[PDB]
Structure formats: structure tokens, C-alpha cells
Design a protein around this ligand. Structure first.
Ligand SMILES: CC1(C#Cc2cnc3c(c2)[C@]2(COC(N)=N2)c2cc(-c4cccnc4F)ccc2O3)COC1
Length: 368
């Protein structure tokens, strides 16, 4: 899949985008890759932040669905006009498909000033599509209309320009070391998974594991941080504070309300603990663990604390994903994790994927 390697770009904190074309003749756009939503939506008007936008008037293959879509999400909102058109991914499979496209005609806090992307590719499932689950997501259309296998994988590499790979329809084994370990997709809406145990520097938090997944845990390329439920975030910080008590930091730092800065070339990585999430495995009573470093959760801006509290559950965002090659195995309803060939690490500690472990009562970890 060499043609798809290095097909993602981005700027720090502004997401990862892939080149796409829409319409006939083809209009090229950069599109944010988002495993945490399920609509394909593109700028269709001359917003001042946009390098370019979809011009339906130039497309002979454009079809109007004569229906609007309104999408407020936690951090912004957009609204648009639904249609279909022919869509391709130049550095993807050599196919062209007719997909649903929301032509964005009004927005607030959606486009980023100074970014190089003009739309969003929602890769999650129809259950959370807008206006409802009858609006077929892009990936579903791709698989239905072609012989592209029902899976994709993401290598998000981080740094400021970031880079990565989206392998559509398969897996590139050069992008990871060791073995893939798979956790089941609990339910096909978000890419929902179940965390069964959490260790900070090898130390279990000992919470009712239900707490780790209240009300859900998801794998989300469209979120920068590792987000955690309050109750779990509270315990998580308490232990990270203690682990890092060598040096002192304000209360705002832990809330992501102020930055902490060290002199260039002298950050104390080693005073900060590793974070290990044990995920439900493929077999009864069997789990595995993924382990990330402070280089993943302490983000350059001076650094931000990139773990934060949540009201909608755990979100394994770019802080988690940049450690790993992540396989969205839709065909087998599972997500694979392996150590990424590009993850950033020091000489003493590196990101890990390890198994098998014995974990009982893992089904009691899911919130209903
Ligand atoms: C499930 C439903 C949705 C949605 C949704 C719509 N638009 C979005 C997003 C979600 C974001 C928010 O979180 C995620 N995962 N996608 C998102 C992140 C970004 C963004 C910003 C900075 C860095 N990375 C990003 F992905 C930009 C733009 C952006 O636009 C359907 O009704 C709720």
C-alpha cells in the first residue's frame, strides 16, 4: 500500500487531513480525518479562513437531495445542504464512488484560522450520522460500491507540521513493530471500546472499571487529548501528581488552564509516569495493555497537559493514537493496536503493546 504511505498532513493541534476530490471535473480539497463522527461535510462558500471550497455549480455529477443538515457539536457548529457527487482519494484506492456530501453553508468555530483543511471525513458508523442513520457514511458507500475491504488503518506520527498514513482497505506491516492486539468494537456507532484496567507507572488506580467507561470509551482521531471521565480523571491526576512530585505545578496546569514551561532542551520527561490502558481482549478473561509516555500527553505549545476531564467518557485521541498503528477492522468488529514505527520516544522508555493478561469480569466494565 506504498502509495497511501505518508498521505496525511497537518499542523499541531489542528488535526490530520487527507487529500480528496469531489465532483466532475475533480475539485481537490484537504479533508480532516475523523473517526469520531460520521458525516462527510465540506466548505461550499467563501469563508475567509478557507483556501478553497466545493463549487457545486461546476460539477456535472452533482445531485441535490433537497434537504438540510444541522450539526451542533460540543466545540462548534455547522449547517449545510445535502447532496451526492463522485468522490475519490488520490493517494488512496484507485476507485471513485458516489457519496453523500453536506455542503457547508453556515458555521461557527468549525473552520480554524490558519489551517489547511476545508472539510471533515466522518469515518464512524451511520448510527451517529446526521440528520439520521439513513444518511450513508462515506466509508460505507466506498465498501458497498467497490471491492475495497471493509477496514482502514491509521498511523498518526505527530511532529510544526505533522504527518501520517491512512491505509484504506488494508494494513501496511512496515508501519508497526511486534504484533497487532485486538479489542472488540462494543457497538457500531462511535468506535466504542472497553478499558478494563488503568495503571500509572504500573500502579493500578483500583477503580470500579465501569468508571473508565462512563458513559463510553471511544477511539477518536478528531480529538487531540486523552479525555477521561471526571471521577477517573480525578484519580488519574492524583497519581500523576504524586509520581511527578519532584517538581511543583499550579492547579490550572492540571486543568489545561495554564501552560508549564522549562528551559529549552531540559524538560524532565522521567519525573512523569507512563500511562497504561488495559483493553478488553478477543478471548474470555483475556486482555492486553497499551502504554504511552509523557511525550504523548505533555504537548508542545512550554507544554500543555493533554489529559482532560469529560462528561461523555474516555476519548482516546491523538495523545493515544500517536503511540500506535491503529487498525479499524470494521469487517471483524474490532480495533487493533501495535507499536508504531514512527512514535516519538526517549532512550529509556518506549510505547508498548503487550499481552496476554488475565482479567476477570471484563463485561462488567461496560456502562449500559
Ligand atoms: C456525532 C456528531 C458529531 C460531530 C462533529 C461535527 N463536526 C466536527 C466534529 C464532530 C469534531 C469534534 O470532535 C471530533 N471527533 N470531530 C471536529 C474536530 C475538529 C478538530 C479540531 C482540532 C483538532 N482536531 C480536530 F479533529 C475540527 C472540526 C470538527 O467538527 C453528529 O452529531 C454529533
Amino acid at each position: 500500500f506504498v502509495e497511501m504511505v505518508d498521505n496525511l498532513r497537518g499542523k499541531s493541534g489542528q488535526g490530520y487531513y487527507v487529500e480528496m476530490t469531489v465532483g466532475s471535473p475533480p475539485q481537490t480539497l484537504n479533508i480532516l480525518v475523523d473517526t469520531g463522527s460520521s458525516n462527510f461535510a465540506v466548505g461550499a462558500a467563501p469563508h475567509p479562513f478557507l483556501h478553497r471550497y466545493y463549487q457545486r455549480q461546476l460539477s456535472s455529477t452533482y445531485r441535490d437531495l433537497r434537504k438540510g443538515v444541522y450539526v451542533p457539536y460540543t466545540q462548534g457548529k455547522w449547517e449545510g445542504e445535502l447532496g451526492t457527487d463522485l468522490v475519490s482519494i488520490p493517494h488512496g484506492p484507485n476507485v471513485t464512488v458516489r457519496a453523500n456530501i453536506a455542503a457547508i453553508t453556515e458555521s461557527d468555530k468549525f473552520f480554524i484560522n490558519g489551517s489547511n483543511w476545508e472539510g471533515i471525513l466522518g469515518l464512524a458508523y451511520a448510527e451517529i450520522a446526521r440528520p439520521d442513520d439513513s444518511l450513508e457514511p462515506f466509508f460505507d458507500s466506498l465498501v458497498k460500491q467497490t471491492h475495497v475491504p471493509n477496514l482502514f488503518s491509521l498511523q498518526l506520527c505527530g511532529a510544526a507540521s505533522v504527518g501520517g498514513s491512512m491505509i484504506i482497505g488494508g494494513i501496511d506491516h512496515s508501519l508497526y513493530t511486534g504484533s497487532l492486539w485486538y479489542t472488540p468494537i462494543r457497538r457500531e456507532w462511535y468506535y466504542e471500546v472497553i478499558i478494563v484496567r488503568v495503571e500509572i507507572n504500573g500502579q493500578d488506580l483500583k477503580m470500579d472499571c465501569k468508571e473508565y467507561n462512563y458513559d463510553k470509551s471511544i477511539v477518536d482521531s478528531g480529538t487531540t487529548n486523552l479525555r477521561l471521565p471526571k471521577k477517573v480523571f480525578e484519580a488519574a491526576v492524583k497519581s500523576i501528581k504524586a509520581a511527578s512530585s519532584t517538581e511543583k505545578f499550579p492547579d490550572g496546569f492540571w486543568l489545561g488552564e495554564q501552560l508549564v514551561c522549562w528551559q529549552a532542551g531540559t524538560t524532565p520527561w522521567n519525573i512523569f509516569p507512563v500511562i497504561s490502558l488495559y483493553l478488553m481482549g478477543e478471548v474470555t478473561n483475556q486482555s492486553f495493555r497499551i502504554t504511552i509516555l509523557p511525550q504523548q500527553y505533555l504537548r508542545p505549545v512550554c507544554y500543555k497537559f493533554a489529559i482532560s476531564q469529560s462528561s461523555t467518557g474516555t476519548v482516546m485521541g491523538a495523545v493515544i493514537m500517536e503511540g500506535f498503528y491503529v487498525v479499524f477492522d470494521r469487517a471483524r468488529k474490532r480495533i487493533g493496536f501495535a507499536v508504531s514505527a514512527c512514535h516519538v520516544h526517549d532512550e529509556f522508555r518506549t510505547a508498548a503493546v503487550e499481552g496476554p493478561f488475565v482479567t476477570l469480569d471484563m463485561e462488567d466494565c461496560g456502562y449500559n
